[PDB]
Amino acid sequence: QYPIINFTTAGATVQSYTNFIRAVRGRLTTGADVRHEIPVLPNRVGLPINQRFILVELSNHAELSVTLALDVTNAYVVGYRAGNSAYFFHPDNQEDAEAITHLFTDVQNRYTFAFGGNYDRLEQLAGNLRENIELGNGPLEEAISALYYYSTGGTQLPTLARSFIICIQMISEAARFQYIEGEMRTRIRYNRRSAPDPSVITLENSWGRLSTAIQESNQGAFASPIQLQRRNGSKFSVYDVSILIPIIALMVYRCAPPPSSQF
Numbered sequence: 001q002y003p004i005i006n007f008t009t010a011g012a013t014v015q016s017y018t019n020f021i022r023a024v025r026g027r028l029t030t031g032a033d034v035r036h037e038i039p040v041l042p043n044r045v046g047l048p049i050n051q052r053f054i055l056v057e058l059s060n061h062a063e064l065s066v067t068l069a070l071d072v073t074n075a076y077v078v079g080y081r082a083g084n085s086a087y088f089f090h091p092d093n094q095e096d097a098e099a100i101t102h103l104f105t106d107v108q109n110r111y112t113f114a115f116g117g118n119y120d121r122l123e124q125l126a127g128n129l130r131e132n133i134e135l136g137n138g139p140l141e142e143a144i145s146a147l148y149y150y151s152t153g154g155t156q157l158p159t160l161a162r163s164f165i166i167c168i169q170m171i172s173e174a175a176r177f178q179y180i181e182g183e184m185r186t187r188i189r190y191n192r193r194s195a196p197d198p199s200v201i202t203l204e205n206s207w208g209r210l211s212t213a214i215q216e217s218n219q220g221a222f223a224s225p226i227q228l229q230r231r232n233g234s235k236f237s238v239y240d241v242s243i244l245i246p247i248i249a250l251m252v253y254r255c256a257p258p259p260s261s262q263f
């Protein structure tokens with residue numbers, strides 16, 4: 001009963017990818033919370049379990065399919081299904097462990113990895129950092145096959161973790177940031193895979209901090225500027241929510257919106 005959004009890497013175009021990312025965002029946000037014109041994801045506090053997850057069904061040219069589960073509170077990929085097996089990252093807490101029991105309920109082989117799903121852990125397992133892992137339609141196509149074959153020994157753990165890293169950035173990070181969506185559009189349009197540059201990496205690393213800075217801002221003004229990087233690695237200071245409107249698509253819930261003290 002959780003919502004399902006479909007995407008295939010087979011014959012993918014900028015438009016089909018765009019449609020996909022827009023649909024994911026539509027299922028993540030409720031319209032209940034928008035601040036400085038930027039939507040906020042649902043608050044985990046009091047969120048009914050029946051509204052907690054969405055499903056992303058990925059298919060490829062190889063005619064394989066896998067289903068990712070995303071937590072609506074943070075767009076986080078919490079696990080996946082391939083045929084008769086489902087795999088979940090190690091939960092951060094009891095409440096999350098219980099919540100994932102509500103996913104892929106009729107799968108006959110349920111596994112919970114002993115490792116969590118954050119980039120740091122996955123990069124260690126992968127033997128490579130994000131900055132050295134190519135993204136694009138080709139990597140996603142290959143990632144889907146890798147996830148599919150894991151249960152039968154065909155996929156090494158390093159290649160699984162690498163494949164997770166690809167999926168997370170092309171789905172979850174793209175949903176969070178129009179900027180990253182745009183980066184993926186480019187790669188898809190020209191069918192040219194490439195690793196993420198510093199502008200992409202710093203945005204991913206800063207999502208929580210940007211979310212908090214905006215929500216705690218004084219009428220949009222940050223108390224403390226945040227440093228990001230442009231493509232060439234050079235510094236870019238963010239002082240205000242204004243410059244982020246075309247860059248960030250969704251925020252994680254960090255605080256309550258203050259009473260809108262009007263003039």
Ligand SMILES: Nc1nc(=O)c2ncc(C(=O)NCC(=O)N[C@@H](Cc3ccccc3)C(=O)N[C@@H](Cc3ccccc3)C(=O)O)nc2[nH]1
Binds near residue numbers: 168173207208209
């Ligand atoms: N499986 C998976 N799905 C994702 O969507 C995902 N998305 C992001 C990351 C990831 O490590 N991000 C690196 C990072 O620095 N994250 C920031 C911002 C953030 C990103 C995603 C979600 C929440 C916050 C952060 O505060 N990370 C936390 C750790 C954390 C907490 C909750 C969820 C993921 C990571 C920290 O450094 O303290 N890992 C993911 N893993």
